[PDB]
């Protein structure tokens, strides 16, 4: 029914005064019941992970009590399903399994990865006291859960020597964006507190700021990635590889981006981009520009960062710097708005932009052009607020179609829920004569 | 003026309670203008290669923008010169040619080899995309440049069937220590990502270590040589031979050290030691001891590793293990401090040690005795830091003299530069 | 009790659509205690040599410390026994002598040959320092050991004028497949480093490969047989003849296969095939097809190579070429899977195939018929891995029976051991019509 996306190029154009552009479809169709949702107003649905494979999809959501940020994790719900045509305007969702993560009080975070008729959930867990109660902010290895239709969920505990991390981590969170399967391996992104014993010079690219001549901005940038304390350690990003996945003896390996090449660690996502791979790192700190990397073989050295700035993250931030110059300061950003590449070098890509208006959010769907042009359509005008977006695209009915998963509140007094929509990406050869 | 080093042995001694030792000279003479240097504070001079032949020397340096490690290569500069006496306390350097490597943005790395009135630069190059811009960490064959006084630099491209390597390599770097010429052949060291599909047991020699599981050390040692990436590959060291150098159609051949017999791949150097040959491999991973091999015909099987531990590499490392026990862990070392052998079995050799003090370095020059005695003299105290050293020795004024080429910063806020100094090795019969 | 094999031909068929084929027996019976085996997990049993004569057999095994490839040779153990019927499903082994080769630390390799109530071990030895310690990778003549029931072993040192080799060899290894006795002579295969002063054109037969134009593949092939070093010399194969073996003054003669007629030198085996003879050469380099030769008088020149490709060696190799085309490359193969001929022309023969599966091996026993049909039966499914096979057949209970000697690990964490099994060869006249 669906196929992995075929990055399409102009069969025609190749003409004087013609531009090959891409743009979002006119409509934003609902994809109902991608996953289950309670109507209980005391419950917050948050931190989704969404990945689409050959034909199946993997989706996960945390159900927390009261507070979306710090409320107790009441449940972590996983859905394996399939993208199918139920005769609607756009593609639809058919859940095949719904499953709950055991002992959710010990989970730091989970994320999903969709492959071929098989799906994965990777979770990091914190240390447990003798009481069984979680000792928060800590790290006690991983759980890997393998999902497959009509097969019991398979559990793997990765602990001890099943993991080897290039730095020593006091806390570990799997990036909610998700990961990918490549052959007999999985790839995720994770971030956390790594112990650090060496001096650093954190990545500190910014615009026109006052007092730049003094090293004061570099001191800000360096402080941004550190920890407050007697023991100062770094909030850092890293790749996780899950080796020997079919063997039944999975091993997890890490390599960490040095502060010289990253901003504060944050929720991330791993992408398969043709023969190459990609990484998205949401803003968590003062730099709110798009942080997206391209890599041929999934290493820190081969990761190159896109120079385009869109989407600029404007919600869920205590920062006060300008979108023009993005001057460094100590502040916190905790949103998520990733992209989906539409070409092999990802010079074309689709995303969702969110701008705050009157303690609500106004949202648009957009496709970025190789020139830098952004084709945008306002979306969800009836919705009160949308705070996050993850997008996964594919071939459906011989066109590129994307599903976007967004946290938000339909009405102001609702508890936060998670909503799924679909749209298509259209290609044109307009002849534009000024 | 200079001759290849004559490992000189006790002329007298041979008496009870008499021991033949060697030691460094009391003074540390400068060797100015071995190669040119810019004052541009935005340029880092890094990764030198220094080799001394019959009478000429070869020197090469990368000039990079801003960052000494990962900054863009603005230039790769080669100097062919002669070691001569200009009436100073010690020997001096006379540049004969200065030349730049074309398209340095495509180079992975280069190294030099000094012969008899002729010198060589071997460079590995990465793939160039359709844009002409380099693709990082990839491989597209080699360039060989032959240098000779009053002769145009002769270039040789070595791609496709002109290079045949015993493993399939995705990335290749020539070891910055340099190489040697033997007859019609050259020998260099190289390292890189080689694809591997067979299970391994990496070389994993250490001291007393008590990991809670205890089985961790072999698994650690196994990871250290493996690569994080899409494809299972090993970071591996290997010998390069350049055949048929006179033909004008040079061919490059490889053989790789298995993980069982090596640590993580790293910058290396090939040595001529009388009738035999030697290899230095800088530490790149948890094992920071001296890794030096001896071989009669330059093969992996005939390579025997010296048991002495000095110099221990203590700078440019994220490792936290002890110099006593060297327990394996996942960490990176990126220094280079080779030795120069002073006897046939390389039981006598000179080296430079660097110890970190308050984010500056304290440095000494030293000579090893066959008993294990170490004769050391502090050097460059006024320099803020020295981070690397390559040493090449020779006969000069009827004595053994060594030149050491060192990366470092004269004062803390300077950009890194490359400095050359000389010293002599004196022979004594202590009682 | 047993007789040398009587290659058996169709007494019937000669009918339309009737085909005379041969096939393996349904069962794979154990042959326990063919030779002794330790329980010490520090010891690897490797490089077996197995030969069956008139009624006795000769068997040898290297016992090395830790590493099967390069571990120190702790022992070289020889067993002379008889194939007998102990009332089992299959034939069984009665060890008659067990003996250790003196000073195993000096041995390069040994191999065996079983005759008529007499067996032989031929060993090549390296040079010794004055310390008594071996100088590896070097050559210092031979030892020949004569074994006979109820008789002490006889030793023959063969040095200096007692060996005449056609090339100057710096290292010499006897092919572990073994040799034969013909009259008053023995015949083995050996390989090693021979000095080379003349240009060469190494055998370079392969399939469809890209870049073939302009040769250059010939350059690979030429390189593949050479040695890396200060001294380049050739890794070459050769026949050994041991003359006047009853004299008590044995002399060893060598004829070397030129590179033009050989791939990289490797462990080999000599066969008696009716009135003619045969040679097996395990793949050691890029060509992994069956290398088997037929010769009427054991000369390099009279050797003809079989055109069949099976068994293809798929284990113990760093090569990455395809089984379809076998493109040359610089790589190493260190397996051993020989055949046993079942007819005078070796158009019928039995073998064992090994295919790698998930860091284990899957194995089958097979018989190839003159038309090209292969009858295969999976064997040793409970075994973790099997990496090598030598097969010798014979008459037993008026049928052809074969014994197969295989290196492998019964379970994954075991040290490598050597295992012996038996099976029979059955003849059929199938009738199939299009």
Q: Three-class SS string for chain A?
A: CEECCCCCCCCCCCCCCEEEEEEECCCCEECCCCCCCCCCCCEEEEEEEEEECCCEEEEEEEEEECCCCCCCEEEEEEEEEEEECCCCCCCEEEEEEEEECCCHHHEEEEEEEECCCCEEEEEEECEECCCCCEECCCCCCEEEEEEECCEEEEEEEECHHHEECCCCEEEEEECCCECEEECCEEEEEEEEEECCCCCCCCCCCCCCCCCCCCCHHHHHHHHHCCCCCCCCCEEEEEEEEEECCCCCCCEEEEEECCHHHCCCCCCEEEEEECCEEEEEECCCCCCCCCCEEEECCCCCCCCEECCCCCCCCCCCECCCCCCCCCCCCCCCECCEECEEECCCCCCCEEEEEEEEECCEEEEEEEEECCCCCEEEEEECCCCCEECEEEEEEEEECCEEEEEEEEEEECCCCCCCEEEEEEEEEEEEEEECCC
Confirm if C423 and C367 have CB atoms less than 8 A apart: no
B230: nearest CA partner in chain A? A297
Facing A298 at nearest CB: one of B219, B229, B330: B229
Candidates C309, C310, C290, C270; CA nearest to C392 is: C270
The rounded distance, in Å, linking the Cα atoms of A385 and A361 is: 5
| Count of the separate structural domains present in chain A | 1
Contacts of A297 in chain B (CB under 8 A): 137, 170, 229-231
Instruction: Give the domain CATH number at A220.
Output: 2.120.10.10
A244: nearest CA partner in chain C? C358
C321: nearest CA partner in chain B? B168
B251: nearest CA partner in chain C? C219
Q: Which residues pair with A227 in a beta bridge?
A: none
CA distance C225 to chain B (A): 12
For the record, the structure tokens of A165 come out as 């991390």
Identify the DSSP state of B34: S
Facing B223 at nearest CB: one of A160, A253, A297: A253
Contacts of A165 in chain B (CB under 8 A): 330
The rounded distance, in Å, linking the Cα atoms of C85 and A65 is: 78
The rounded distance, in Å, linking the Cα atoms of C160 and A59 is: 78
Torsion sign (Cα): A159, A279, A77, A115? negative
Contacts of C359 in chain A (CB under 8 A): 247
C333: nearest CA partner in chain B? B198
Ordered DSSP codes for B54-65: SSEEEEEEEEEE
CA distance A302 to chain B (A): 6
Q: How many CA within 13 A on the CB side of residue C76?
A: 25
Is B330 in contact with A165 (Cβ distance < 8 A)?
yes
Confirm if C175 and C111 have CB atoms less than 8 A apart: yes
Facing C330 at nearest CB: one of B164, B195, B198: B164
* Residue partners of C213: CB distance under 8 A and separation at least 6: none
The rounded distance, in Å, linking the Cα atoms of A396 and A424 is: 9
**H-helix or E-strand spanning residue C429:** strand C417-431
Provide the total of helices (H) and of strands (E) in chain C, helices listed first: 1, 32
What's the Rg (C-alpha) of chain C? 21
The rounded distance, in Å, linking the Cα atoms of A140 and A127 is: 5
Confirm if B294 and B344 have CB atoms less than 8 A apart: no
Confirm if C199 and C152 have CB atoms less than 8 A apart: no
* SS3 of residue B203 by DSSP: coil
Facing B228 at nearest CB: one of A161, A198, A255: A255
CA distance C360 to chain A (A): 11
C135: nearest CA partner in chain B? B302
Beta strand C169-174 with C180-182: parallel, antiparallel or unpaired? unpaired
Candidates A425, A370, A421; CA nearest to A396 is: A425
Resolution (A): 3.4
Residues of A with CB under 8 A from a CB of B: 160-161, 164-166, 182, 185, 197-199, 239, 241, 253-255, 277, 296-299, 301-302, 304
Cβ count within 10 A of residue B317: 20
The rounded distance, in Å, linking the Cα atoms of C431 and C434 is: 10
The rounded distance, in Å, linking the Cα atoms of B272 and C228 is: 17
Is B230 in contact with A298 (Cβ distance < 8 A)?
yes
**What is the residue range of A8's domain?**
2-431
The method recorded for this entry reads X-ray
CA distance A151 to chain C (A): 22
Residues of B with CB under 8 A from a CB of C: 160-161, 164-168, 182, 185, 195-199, 239, 241, 251, 253-255, 260, 277, 296-299, 301-302
The rounded distance, in Å, linking the Cα atoms of A188 and A163 is: 14
Phi then psi dihedrals of residue B157, to 5 deg: -90, 135
CA distance C356 to chain A (A): 14
Q: H-type helices in C43-195, by residue range?
A: none
* Residue partners of A65: CB distance under 8 A and separation at least 6: A42, A43, A44, A71, A72, A74
* Residue partners of C153: CB distance under 8 A and separation at least 6: C97, C99, C145, C146, C147
Is C219 in contact with B161 (Cβ distance < 8 A)?
yes
Is A161 in contact with B359 (Cβ distance < 8 A)?
no
Neighbours of chain B (3+ CB pairs under 8 A): A, C
Is B160 in contact with C216 (Cβ distance < 8 A)?
yes
CA distance C384 to chain A (A): 14
CA distance A246 to chain C (A): 9
CA distance B229 to chain A (A): 5
Neighbours of chain A (3+ CB pairs under 8 A): B, C
Range C147-186 burial, b when 16+ CB lie within 10 A, else e:
bbeeeebeebebeeebbebebebebbbbbbbbbbbeeebb
Is C330 in contact with B299 (Cβ distance < 8 A)?
no
The rounded distance, in Å, linking the Cα atoms of B205 and A137 is: 36
Residues of C with CB under 8 A from a CB of B: 67, 70, 136-137, 211, 216-217, 219-220, 223, 227-231, 318, 320, 330-332, 359
Cβ count within 10 A of residue B395: 15
Residues of A with CB under 8 A from a CB of C: 246-247
Interface test with A, best of C356, C357, C358, C360 (most A CBs within 10 A): C358
CA distance C276 to chain B (A): 39
CA dihedral angle for residue A102, residue A105, residue A111, residue A112, rounded to 10 degrees? 20
* Residue partners of A183: CB distance under 8 A and separation at least 6: none
The rounded distance, in Å, linking the Cα atoms of C393 and C4 is: 8
Candidates C324, C332, C169; CA nearest to C253 is: C169
Identify the DSSP state of B225: H
């Amino acid at each position: 029914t669906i196929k992995p996306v075929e990055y399409y190029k102009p069969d025609g154009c190749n003409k004087t005064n013609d531009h090959f552009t891409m743009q979002p479809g006119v409509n934003f169709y609902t994809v109902p019941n991608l996953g289950p949702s309670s109507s209980s107003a005391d419950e917050c649905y948050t931190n989704p992970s969404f990945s689409i494979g050959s034909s199946i999809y993997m989706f996960s959501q945390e159900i927390r009590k009261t507070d979306c940020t710090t409320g107790e994790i009441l449940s972590i719900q996983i859905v394996l399903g399939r993208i199918v045509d139920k005769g609607q305007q756009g593609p639809q969702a058919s859940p095949l399994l719904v499953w709950s993560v055991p002992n959710p009080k010990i989970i730091n975070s989970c994320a999903v990865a969709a492959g071929d008729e098989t799906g994965w959930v990777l979770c990091s867990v914190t240390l447990t006291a003798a009481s069984g109660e979680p000792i928060p902010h800590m790290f006690d290895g991983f759980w890997l859960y393998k999902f497959e239709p009509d097969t019991e969920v398979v559990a793997y505990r990765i602990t001890g020597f099943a993991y080897l991390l290039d730095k020593v981590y006091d806390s570990v969170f799997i990036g909610k964006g998700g990961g990918i399967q490549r052959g007999n391996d999985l790839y995720f992104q994770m971030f956390g507190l790594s112990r650090n014993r060496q001096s650093i010079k954190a990545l500190c690219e910014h615009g026109s700021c006052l007092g730049t001549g003094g090293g004061g901005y570099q001191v800000l940038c360096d402080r941004a990635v550190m920890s407050f304390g007697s023991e100062e350690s770094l909030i850092s990003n890293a790749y996780l590889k899950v080796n020997d996945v079919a063997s039944g003896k999975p091993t997890i390996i890490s390599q960490t981006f040095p502060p010289s090449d990253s901003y504060k660690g944050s929720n991330g996502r791993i992408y398969t981009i043709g023969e190459r791979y990609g990484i998205y790192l949401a803003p968590s700190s003062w730099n709110r520009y798009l942080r997206f990397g391209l890599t041929p073989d999934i290493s820190v050295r081969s990761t190159t960062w896109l120079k385009e700035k869109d989407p600029i993250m404007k919600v869920l931030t205590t920062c006060t710097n300008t979108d023009k110059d993005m001057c460094p300061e100590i502040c916190n950003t905790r949103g998520y708005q990733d992209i989906f590449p539409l070409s092999e070098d990802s010079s074309f890509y689709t995303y969702i932009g969110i701008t705050p208006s009157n303690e609500g959010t106004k949202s648009f769907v957009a496709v970025k052009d190789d020139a830098g042009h952004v084709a945008s359509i306002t979306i969800l005008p009836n919705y009160y607020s949308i705070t996050s977006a993850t997008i996964s695209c594919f071939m459906y009915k011989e066109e590129i179609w994307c599903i976007a998963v967004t946290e938000g509140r339909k009405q102001k007094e609702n508890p936060q829920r998670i909503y799924a929509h679909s749209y298509r990406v259209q290609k044109m050869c307009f002849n534009i004569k000024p």
